[PDB]
Each structure stands twice: as C-alpha cells, then as structure tokens.
Enzyme design. Structure first.
Site, short mmCIF file in Angstrom:
data_model
loop_
_atom_site.label_atom_id
_atom_site.label_comp_id
_atom_site.label_asym_id
_atom_site.label_seq_id
_atom_site.Cartn_x
_atom_site.Cartn_y
_atom_site.Cartn_z
N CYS B 109 -36.94 -121.67 -19.95
CA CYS B 109 -36.59 -120.26 -20.00
C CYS B 109 -35.10 -120.09 -20.24
O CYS B 109 -34.12 -120.54 -19.97
CB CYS B 109 -36.85 -119.86 -18.44
SG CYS B 109 -36.29 -118.13 -18.17
N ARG B 112 -32.64 -117.21 -17.66
CA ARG B 112 -32.24 -117.99 -16.35
C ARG B 112 -30.80 -117.58 -16.10
O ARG B 112 -30.31 -117.72 -14.98
CB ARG B 112 -32.42 -119.26 -16.51
CG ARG B 112 -33.90 -119.76 -16.25
CD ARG B 112 -33.76 -121.59 -16.37
NE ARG B 112 -33.49 -122.04 -17.46
CZ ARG B 112 -32.91 -123.28 -17.88
NH1 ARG B 112 -32.56 -123.62 -16.95
NH2 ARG B 112 -32.93 -123.60 -19.30
N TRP B 281 -38.35 -109.33 -18.02
CA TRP B 281 -38.52 -108.51 -19.11
C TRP B 281 -38.59 -109.27 -20.44
O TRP B 281 -38.23 -110.65 -20.26
CB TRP B 281 -37.58 -107.36 -18.94
CG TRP B 281 -36.17 -108.04 -18.92
CD1 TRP B 281 -35.33 -108.63 -19.97
CD2 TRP B 281 -35.23 -108.28 -17.87
NE1 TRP B 281 -34.18 -108.94 -19.62
CE2 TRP B 281 -33.92 -108.78 -18.33
CE3 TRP B 281 -35.29 -107.91 -16.27
CZ2 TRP B 281 -32.89 -109.25 -17.45
CZ3 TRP B 281 -34.26 -108.30 -15.77
CH2 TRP B 281 -33.35 -108.88 -16.35
N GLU B 286 -40.63 -112.33 -28.58
CA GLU B 286 -41.91 -112.46 -28.05
C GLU B 286 -43.19 -111.64 -28.09
O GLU B 286 -44.16 -112.26 -28.52
CB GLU B 286 -41.84 -112.63 -26.26
CG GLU B 286 -41.14 -113.64 -25.82
CD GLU B 286 -40.92 -113.70 -24.36
OE1 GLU B 286 -41.86 -114.34 -23.54
OE2 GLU B 286 -40.15 -112.96 -23.76
C1 HEM Z 1 -35.70 -111.57 -16.91
C2 HEM Z 1 -36.12 -111.72 -18.39
C3 HEM Z 1 -36.25 -113.12 -18.84
C4 HEM Z 1 -36.62 -113.25 -20.08
C5 HEM Z 1 -35.73 -112.70 -21.21
C6 HEM Z 1 -37.13 -114.76 -20.27
C7 HEM Z 1 -37.40 -115.14 -21.43
C8 HEM Z 1 -38.45 -116.19 -21.71
C9 HEM Z 1 -38.78 -116.94 -22.97
C10 HEM Z 1 -38.44 -116.39 -24.34
C11 HEM Z 1 -39.37 -117.97 -22.71
C12 HEM Z 1 -40.36 -118.84 -23.99
C13 HEM Z 1 -41.90 -118.78 -23.82
C14 HEM Z 1 -42.17 -118.17 -25.10
O1 HEM Z 1 -41.23 -117.71 -25.82
O2 HEM Z 1 -43.32 -118.62 -25.54
C15 HEM Z 1 -39.66 -118.31 -21.22
C16 HEM Z 1 -40.17 -119.28 -20.72
C17 HEM Z 1 -40.32 -119.24 -19.15
N1 HEM Z 1 -39.77 -118.40 -18.17
FE1 HEM Z 1 -38.28 -116.94 -18.47
N2 HEM Z 1 -37.59 -114.95 -19.15
C18 HEM Z 1 -37.19 -114.23 -17.98
C19 HEM Z 1 -37.38 -114.25 -16.95
C20 HEM Z 1 -38.01 -115.10 -16.06
C21 HEM Z 1 -38.54 -115.10 -14.75
C22 HEM Z 1 -38.15 -114.27 -13.64
C23 HEM Z 1 -39.07 -116.36 -14.27
C24 HEM Z 1 -39.84 -116.76 -12.99
C25 HEM Z 1 -39.22 -116.30 -11.81
C26 HEM Z 1 -39.31 -116.93 -15.66
C27 HEM Z 1 -39.80 -118.52 -15.76
C28 HEM Z 1 -39.99 -118.80 -17.02
C29 HEM Z 1 -40.92 -120.16 -17.01
C30 HEM Z 1 -41.43 -121.16 -16.07
C31 HEM Z 1 -41.04 -120.55 -18.50
C32 HEM Z 1 -41.48 -121.48 -19.01
C33 HEM Z 1 -43.08 -121.55 -19.01
C34 HEM Z 1 -43.76 -122.81 -19.59
O3 HEM Z 1 -43.14 -123.97 -19.40
O4 HEM Z 1 -44.30 -122.74 -20.40
N3 HEM Z 1 -38.67 -116.36 -16.52
N4 HEM Z 1 -38.83 -117.24 -20.73
C1 LIG Z 2 -46.58 -117.88 -26.58
N1 LIG Z 2 -45.84 -118.69 -25.88
C2 LIG Z 2 -46.92 -119.92 -25.42
C3 LIG Z 2 -47.01 -120.03 -23.95
C4 LIG Z 2 -47.85 -120.92 -23.54
C5 LIG Z 2 -48.06 -120.87 -22.20
C6 LIG Z 2 -48.90 -121.90 -21.93
N2 LIG Z 2 -49.87 -122.66 -21.51
C7 LIG Z 2 -47.19 -120.11 -21.38
C8 LIG Z 2 -46.49 -119.16 -21.84
C9 LIG Z 2 -45.37 -118.53 -20.82
C10 LIG Z 2 -43.99 -118.43 -21.11
C11 LIG Z 2 -43.31 -117.36 -20.30
C12 LIG Z 2 -43.26 -117.56 -18.90
C13 LIG Z 2 -42.65 -116.30 -18.22
C14 LIG Z 2 -41.92 -115.25 -18.86
C15 LIG Z 2 -41.23 -114.50 -18.29
C16 LIG Z 2 -41.39 -114.34 -16.99
C17 LIG Z 2 -40.59 -113.53 -19.04
C18 LIG Z 2 -40.60 -113.38 -20.39
N3 LIG Z 2 -40.06 -112.41 -21.08
N4 LIG Z 2 -41.31 -114.30 -20.90
C19 LIG Z 2 -41.89 -115.42 -20.46
C20 LIG Z 2 -42.86 -116.43 -21.02
C21 LIG Z 2 -46.12 -119.04 -23.28
#
Ligand code: HEM
Ligand SMILES: CNCc1cc(C#N)cc(CCc2ccc3c(C)cc(N)nc3c2)c1
Ligand code: HEM
Ligand SMILES: CNCc1cc(C#N)cc(CCc2ccc3c(C)cc(N)nc3c2)c1
Ligand SMILES: C[C@H](O)[C@H](O)[C@H]1CNc2nc(N)[nH]c(=O)c2N1
Ligand SMILES: C[C@H](O)[C@H](O)[C@H]1CNc2nc(N)[nH]c(=O)c2N1
Ligand SMILES: [Zn+2]
Lengths: 411, 410
Positions: B109, B112, B281, B286
């Site tokens: 993430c 964070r 958010w 994304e």
């Molecule tokens: C507040 C603004 C936040 C932004 C801008 C953000 C952004 C992102 C982005 C860009 C990803 C990559 C996933 C993708 O691009 O497909 C990601 C993954 C992730 N986010 Fe954050 N996130 C935010 C908040 C949070 C919050 C509040 C949580 C949980 C409390 C969280 C938990 C996670 C987790 C667990 C992943 C990876 C999940 C996996 O392993 O597939 N995020 N986030």
């Molecule tokens: C299109 N990306 C591929 C993807 C695959 C899985 C799975 N399985 C799960 C995810 C979730 C990733 C994720 C989780 C949490 C997020 C939060 C809390 C905020 C944010 N802006 N993006 C997130 C993005 C993505």
C-alpha cells in the site's frame, strides 16, 4: 517440484521446472524479499565442478551428452585445471557461453534475440591498444550504418585477479558529465565521476554537453590507457519531434549503439572481466531514463515549459505529458534516420512471446519483473500483468566493482 | 543482517532492522524470488496463544507499559480465556491498534502515510446480513463525508469454527456491474462479470447499464448470503470530463469516489476477521490507468485516441501512452473539480518516501513491495522507482481469502 506463473491479463499459465537447475542465490529468504535491491581469486577446489556443470550443459545442447567427445573434454579440462589451476574454453564453448549468459539475463527484456549474438573472440589480446582495436571493430560491426547487430567482444579471462582486463567505461559510447563550480552539471550527470578520471588521466575535455568520452582500457592488470573512438565510428541521432518544431532547438542528440562494458561474463567458473556487449536501444532507455530522470539530462522542465504546460501542481501530469512527447521524439528521430530502435510496446510484446516459448522448449525463463516492466506506461504493456520467476542461471553476466576502487596503480 | 536500502536518485541509505521482527513467509527462497507473484481449518489452542502473546507484547510496548502490571495481567487474562474458550476477544483498544497496524504493515500500500488516522468501527456485535448492511451503509456514509473522504474500517465478528464466517461477497463495497453480451464482448465492467452473474444468479435485477452499482451480497454467521442495495444518495460518483477536451464528456464515463475493499481477511493476535471492509481514497491511476485502460477492463484507450485523432497505425507513435496520460489528467481534474478527495501518483509516491523515511526513523523499517508501490504509469519519474524496498510480512495484517462462493456450504 514444479512452479506456476500466471498472466493475469490473458489467464495463460506456465510451468517452470528450469528453476531447479538454479545454482546461485537470489538475496531472498523465506522471511525477506530483496527483489528490488539493485545489487544483491577463484581456486581449483571449486573450479572443476563449475567446469563440469558448464560442459554437461554444453554437450546436452549439442546432443552429445555422455559422448566420448564429452568425456575426453571433461578429462582434458580436468587435467588442464589441476596442472594449470585454470582452463581454456574452445571457441564453440565460448560462443555457447556468451549466448546463454545473455539468455540467462533475467533483467533483459530484449532476450528474444539471444541466439543471434555475434561473438568476437579477443582472448589473444594483450595490450590496451589491442583492446582499442578490437573495440573499434566491435562498434563498426555492431553499428552497421544504423542497422544494428548484437555483438559481444571477449577479452582474456581473469587468472590470479592481478592481471585483469577491464574496460573502465560503463558503456563503450557515453557522454561526458562536468560538475560546474556553481553546482550545475554540463553533459550527462551519470558520467561525472568517470569523466573526472578520464580528465585526470589526461583527457582533454571539449566540455560540451555532448562530448563522447574516451575509452579507458586496462590490459593484463596494467594501468589503463586513453583512446579516442574515431568519431566516424560513433553513430549519433539528432533529436527532433514530429509535430513540435521547437524540439530540435533543445539541441539534443543521442548515440545509436548501447554497448555495456563494465560487466563480468561467467562461463564454467571462468571470469571474463572485460566483455563489452551491445544491441540496440529500447526507446524508453533514452527517452525516460537518459533525459527525464532527475539525475540525468532532466529536460522535463524545459520540454514542459515549451509545451506551455501547467507546471504548478503535479496533478496536471505535466511531467507525464512531457515524458511521452520526449519519447515520441526519440523514436521518431531514430526511425527517421533508419537507426535501429524498439518502442517499449513492441519490446514487451516480443518478450512475452519469447518467455512463453522459453517455458515450452526450456522449462522456464528467469525474469526480473522490477526490471522488465518499462519505466513508463507499465500496465499498458503485457509484461506488467505477467507473473515472473526470478532465479540465477550460469553462464551469467554479473556486476563487478568499478576498477578504480580495486586497482593497484603501477605508475 | 541489519539490512540497508539505497535510494539511487538521492543516495539516501536507510537501515532496516524491523525485518528481524518478521514472522510470516514471503514465498521466496535463496534459489528463487517470487516477488512478482500475485499471491503465494481454524487455529488450535496451542498455536493461538503465542500469536496472542506476540500481539500483546507489541501493544504494551507501543503504550510504553511493557513488562508492567497492566501488561502481565492482560497476558494472564488472555491466556486463561484461550485455554477455556479455545479463543479470545480483543479489548477495543487492541482492536483499534491491531487494525491500524494491519494497514501500517500492508507492504503493497502506497497510501500508508495516513495509517494512524484510521477510523475503526467495531461491528463485532453484528448478527445478520441486515445488520451488516446497516454497518456498511454507515461506513460508506462516514467515509464519503460529502467528498471529503476519510479512512475507515468496519470489523465484523471474528471467525470461530469456520462454519460461522462473516463475509462480504463483494470485492469492493462499490463496483460497477459487468455484463456478458450476445454480441461477444462485455458491457459495464469486465472484472465484475462473474460476480454480476452471481448476483443475478442469487436474484438481482440488473439495470444492464454500463455503470450499474452492484448490490451488496452479505453473509452473516455462515448463512446463505443476502442482496442489499446501497442507497444511491450514499454512492458519490464523479462524471469524468477533460479540462481541455470538451469532447471527453461525450464518452459518458464516470467513476465512484470511494475505494472500499471488502474481500480481505484481517488477522490480529491470531484472530481472523473475514469481514472487515476498509476504505480510503483513490490514487488517480487506479481508475485512469487500470480501471479504464487495462484490456481485461474498460479498455477505452482505443476510442479515446481516435477522438484525439492520433496515429494508431504503429505502436511507436506512443498513441496509447498519450491517451493514457490525457485520461488520467481527466480523472484527477474531474474529482478535484467536484471536491472529491483524490491523490495523483506523483504526490502519493512522494508522500510514501517521506513515510518510509519516517518508519525507518521511528520504527526501524517499513516493509514494501516495489512491484506494487510503483505506479502503473510514469514509473521512473516517481521517487519510489529508484527506491530500494525490503518486503516482508509483519503482523497484524491484511491477507487474501478464497472467494466465498467456492467455499460456502450452501
Ligand atoms: C487513504 C488513501 C489510500 C491510498 C491512496 C491507497 C493506495 C493504494 C494503492 C494504489 C494500492 C495498490 C493496489 C493497486 O494499485 O491495484 C493499495 C493497496 C493496498 N491498500 Fe492502500 N491506499 C489507501 C488507504 C488504505 C487503507 C485505509 C487501507 C486499510 C486500512 C489500505 C490497505 C491496502 C492493502 C491491504 C493493499 C494491498 C492489498 C493486496 O495485497 O492486494 N489502504 N493501496
Ligand atoms: C486492480 N489491482 C488488482 C487488485 C487485485 C486484488 C486482488 N486479489 C486486490 C486489490 C485491492 C488493492 C487495494 C486495496 C485497498 C485500497 C484502498 C483501501 C484504497 C485505494 N485507493 N486502493 C486500494 C487498493 C487490487
Ligand atoms: C538487442 C536488443 C536489446 C535490448 C532492446 C535490450 C534491452 C534491455 C533493457 C531495457 C534493459 C534494462 C536496463 C535498463 O533499463 O537500465 C536490459 C538489461 C540487460 N541486458 Fe538487454 N537489451 C538488448 C540486448 C542485450 C545484449 C546483446 C546483451 C548481452 C550480450 C544484453 C544483456 C543485458 C544484461 C546483462 C542486462 C542486465 C543489466 C543489469 O543487470 O544491470 N542485452 N536490456
Ligand atoms: C537507466 N538505468 C541505468 C543503468 C543501470 C545499470 C545498473 N546497475 C545498468 C544499466 C545497463 C543495463 C543494460 C545492459 C545492456 C543493454 C543492452 C546490451 C542493450 C540495451 N538496449 N540496453 C541495455 C541495458 C543501465
Ligand atoms: C503479474 C503482476 O505481479 C501483477 O500484474 C501485479 C503487478 N503489480 C501491481 N501493482 C499494483 N499497484 N496493482 C496491481 O494489481 C499489480 N498487479
Ligand atoms: C530500486 C530499483 O531496483 C532500481 O531503481 C531499478 C528498478 N527497476 C529498473 N528497471 C530498469 N529497466 N532499469 C533500471 O535501472 C531499474 N532500476
Ligand atoms: Zn524475492
């Protein structure tokens, strides 16, 4: 134990068995991944196993595994090792070794071409001047008036580590970088240190933003010597943009031949510390990294300004916009001049086909995702959605410390 | 083994010691790196207690009462309940700590830096899907906050015997429907094709538009899951227009403002929260890079470039790239105009580097998955690209879990 990788775009799944033939280590463990870390005097005690392993591979490849030719060669190499503490590769072996080194290069998106490598045997070289001559001919041959050809030139192997052949340049062709007193940099910031060394060694710097650097060549462990590549050998491409007439006025140009010279070729335990190799550019190498990286020519600003972009907040993506245009212009310029170049879309597509082919005929293809994915527009290339196993196979290209940090100076 | 990470753009070198606290496994070995692999029966009373002790040791360390009266008591207290009830319950404070740190530890993430400002909703008293629906509606409304988005997680009852699992079957609280067409291809959102079916296949009446907000499909205590429609007034959407191209609005695109992931499992002190929807958010890319331009998704690049009259004959014109940038300029512009929270990939990655530096400084490290932290466009001109990152699994954590329909004793 078999291993699966999945392409999440196309749901194609592939099965790797090749990873079992892996010897070297990754830097990773069960509790840590070092997959994004940039970087993670050999005795006869461990040389013959390395030799045998290579020769076994070699004779497998020519469908002679277990042949009398195979066994005698093993015997021959054995005897030569305990007698001389090292050994020599036959020409066939060297060619095989170099081609597979490239093939095993898990960070290289260009490996579809790996079987078509021109191997120049420079193992009879003995002096810097001789090195200069071999290198000149590499450049002329590889450049081919813009119709680029893959080639590698292999200088003598390391012996006791005290008589190394090294090319001190990181690439055969590169632009000088000059730290100005006011802190600004003229030329390529990536090359300031090497430029200084060259200057200290007695290079007379024209001090322009695009001065081709001299070759600094070291033979048999002797102090390196300076040579100027003849300018008619250095193919260069002035950078213009197809729609933007003001782009040419940015005064940019780049050389056509990417030729890496600071790596170490390992083949059957033998170490080739000078082994310059060349191919052709993926456009993003120049257009994203060489120009737009903050620590390089960094023309992003100037291009953005000239495009009259909103350079206030970053959320205008003015950086992204300029970056595209600069890469458009790089590809445009090269193609216009019939100098070989590949765009990142074409290269990544080829690599996926290469990789799939490699899984089928070889049981796998080691690949470093972090490096294979292009530095722009990642997810709209098909390698981004491609899972990849990374593991280390020999023969291999390896890093080695910059010679100026280890070298003992004769004077 | 006190590892170093270098930023090559800046020569900043951080020393990582936090990795030695790691417990779980990466999927890698010394012979093979799996860092690009998408993803590499309850707890016995025996392996549950050290899990609890480990978590409680962190907790009381973080509140500077390590080895204290309070600490020892609670440790004893949990120990007793485990031996007795074969499980245990978190104090509210531990729950909050746990959730916040699961985010902190989420190595994929980029967002964070905000980790400690998480709003935690304790929904452990929930017993029905209708209940879940209500908690989820309040989550969505609170998080949305009229476009001033706020981080939140809502935590439903922890797993027991695996037969009474609480699950939100949706992958995100809010996602557009995806329809298989007789014409061949796909209408709506291709990622959600199977779910859109399951919904219908469980009784949903699809409007068969392109941006049909999927219904919630909630499962309480391991019963047959249930369909609920999110009140539209709670679903904030942004019409997508371009700041310089007025033809762009004619494309008829919009996205929802609230990314809210609902299919992951939150693990704290060995306890498994299989329903724990959380939301923050969006980073602009994304939606613009992935949700619009991925071929297995909206895949609108082609027609966008056409309206731009770009030369789509050969790839080397970089028309895809050019369009990709404009699309992403539009998304940001749209959200920003409607005062809905959004961050650009430059801003977010810069934030993350600061967060990294902060974590190395005050915690001794920060697990990070370079493959996921680097944005899917303009990678090398964002600061994270030249940043070495160590990836390892800390607890508490968010983990993946099977899609419920593959498991559910129906
Ligand atoms: C507040 C603004 C936040 C932004 C801008 C953000 C952004 C992102 C982005 C860009 C990803 C990559 C996933 C993708 O691009 O497909 C990601 C993954 C992730 N986010 Fe954050 N996130 C935010 C908040 C949070 C919050 C509040 C949580 C949980 C409390 C969280 C938990 C996670 C987790 C667990 C992943 C990876 C999940 C996996 O392993 O597939 N995020 N986030
Ligand atoms: C299109 N990306 C591929 C993807 C695959 C899985 C799975 N399985 C799960 C995810 C979730 C990733 C994720 C989780 C949490 C997020 C939060 C809390 C905020 C944010 N802006 N993006 C997130 C993005 C993505
Ligand atoms: C012919 C066309 C070729 C193309 C388009 C190509 C492209 C690339 C690119 C883009 C990289 C990533 C490096 C970076 O972006 O900084 C790379 C890495 C690499 N390439 Fe290729 N390459 C080609 C030919 C070759 C040849 C002929 C060899 C050796 C004989 C080779 C060996 C390598 C090696 C060893 C790396 C790893 C660099 C490292 O570990 O630091 N490549 N290639
Ligand atoms: C923008 N990154 C600069 C850079 C860093 C390292 C390292 N370490 C190594 C390299 C060279 C990697 C390489 C090696 C060989 C290549 C060949 C033969 C062709 C080509 N088009 N690119 C190469 C690229 C570059
Ligand atoms: C195959 C590859 O590992 C997979 O496509 C990953 C790569 N990196 C990613 N990075 C982000 N942020 N989101 C993703 O979905 C993915 N997908
Ligand atoms: C830290 C990171 O490993 C480093 O910046 C790498 C990332 N991926 C790369 N990928 C390519 N093609 N070239 C590079 O120089 C790098 N640099
Ligand atoms: Zn790894």
């Amino acid at each position: 134990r078999f291993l699966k990788v999945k392409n999440w775009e196309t749901d194609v799944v592939l099965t790797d068995t090749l990873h079992l033939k892996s010897t070297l280590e990754t830097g990773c463990t069960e509790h840590i991944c070092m997959g994004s870390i940039m970087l993670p005097v050999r005795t006869k005690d461990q040389l013959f196993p390395l030799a045998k392993e290579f020769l076994d591979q070699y004779y497998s490849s020519i469908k002679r595994f277990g042949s009398k030719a195979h066994m005698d060669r093993l015997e021959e190499v054995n005897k030569e090792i305990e007698s001389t503490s090292t050994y020599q590769l036959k020409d066939t072996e060297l060619i095989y070794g170099a081609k597979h080194a490239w093939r095993n290069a898990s960070r290289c998106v260009g490996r579809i071409q790996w079987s078509k490598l021109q191997v120049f045997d420079a193992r009879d070289c003995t002096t810097a001047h001789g090195m200069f001559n071999y290198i000149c001919n590499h450049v002329k041959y590889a450049t081919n008036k813009g119709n680029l050809r893959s080639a590698i030139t292999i200088f003598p192997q390391r012996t006791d580590g005290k008589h190394d052949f090294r090319v001190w340049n990181s690439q055969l062709i590169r632009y000088a970088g000059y730290k100005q007193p006011d802190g600004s940099t003229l030329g390529d910031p990536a090359n300031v240190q090497f430029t200084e060394i060259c200057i200290q060694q007695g290079w007379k710097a024209p001090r322009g933003r695009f001065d081709v650097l001299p070759l600094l060549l070291q033979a048999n462990g002797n102090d390196p010597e300076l040579f100027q590549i003849p300018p008619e050998l250095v193919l260069e491409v002035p950078i213009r943009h197809p729609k933007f007439d003001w782009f040419k006025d940015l005064g940019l140009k780049w050389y056509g031949l990417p030729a890496v010279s600071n790596m170490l070729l390992e083949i059957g335990g033998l170490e080739f510390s000078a082994c310059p190799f060349s191919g052709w550019y993926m456009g993003t190498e120049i257009g994203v990294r060489d120009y737009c990286d903050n620590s390089r020519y960094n023309i992003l600003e100037e291009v953005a300004k000239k495009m009259d972009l909103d350079m206030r907040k970053t959320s205008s993506l003015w950086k992204d916009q300029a970056l595209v245009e600069i890469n458009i212009a790089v590809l445009y310029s090269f193609q216009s001049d019939k100098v070989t170049i590949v765009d990142h879309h074409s290269a990544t597509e080829s690599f996926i086909k290469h990789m799939e082919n490699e899984y089928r005929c070889r049981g796998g293809c080691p690949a470093d995702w972090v490096w294979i994915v292009p530095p722009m527009s990642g997810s709209i290339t098909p390698v981004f959605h491609q899972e990849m196993l990374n593991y280390r196979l020999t023969p291999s290209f390896e890093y080695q410390p910059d010679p100026w940090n280890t070298h003992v100076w004769k004077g």
